[PDB]
């Protein structure tokens, strides 16, 4: 077994690498909401009154460039007004 | 076995690369919304009263210039007004 | 077995590579909404009054730009007013 | 086994490596909530009543340039007014 | 086993490696909340009553340059106004 990556390199990459050998990851999370995710065990048994009400409010705005995108030669601008 | 990548580059690059190999991810979450996702054992097991509402107000805009997708001369722009 | 990939590159690419070999992925998700996704054994077993109500309000507006679309030689632009 | 990895680089990268071997991660997280994530074991058990709400006001705005997206010439602004 | 990794570097580079070998990570959180994480044994076990109020005010904003990016030759400014 031999792995060979990214060898005699000249000049100005722009990498991002993860190698993972066997023999014998990237995560982003924005803005993520979670209610009641896991309770215990029997809750709420017997005779369990429950009011439940979730406020999200306001307008809401996302704006992404090139998510998950590599540049090159390029220009990016997000102008906004 | 002999795995080769990417090898005497020369110049100026826009890499991404994940090498996994074996021998005998990239996740991206924005606004991700979950309700009571799991319960225990035997939740509301007799005479149970849930009122359940849930409110997600307001306008929502979004904006993805180029997702999934590699540059290489190129411009890019969002220009609201 | 012999896997070659890319090898004596010479100018500026874009490039997103994941290599899997064995020998004997890119998830995005935007605005997803999950409602009792999965309860535990037995839940209201008797006698269950449950009101269940959901609200997703506003207008709702989704602009992408080439999504898994790689560029070449390209001029992209989302102009709104 | 032999992992080779990066060998004589000559000018000016710019790299993100993790690497992982066996024989025989990067976490980003803004703006998260959780509400009651997970209890002990048998909690109101009995004649329990509840009024639970949550308020998340005001409007939201995100903005992000070239999330995951590696630059090798290029030019970003994020302009506002 | 013979693990290489970045030898005879020549000239101004910008790394970041992590590497592990086994033989026989990053993380960042801005501006999470978490309510009720996680409770002892049999709470609020009889005659419970609760009432749960959260408030996040004001508006929010957010504004992020090349969040998991790394620059070879560029110029990025974030400008308000």
Request: charged share 20%.
């Amino acid at each position: 077994l031999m792995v060979k990556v990214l060898d005699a390199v000249r000049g100005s990459p722009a990498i991002n690498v993860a190698v993972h050998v066997f023999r014998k990851i990237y995560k982003v999370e924005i803005d993520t909401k979670s209610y009641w995710k896991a309770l215990g065990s029997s809750p709420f048994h017997e005779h369990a009154e429950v009011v439940f009400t979730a406020n999200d409010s306001g307008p809401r705005r996302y704006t992404i460039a090139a998510l998950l995108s590599p540049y090159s030669y390029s220009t990016t601008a997000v102008v906004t007004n």
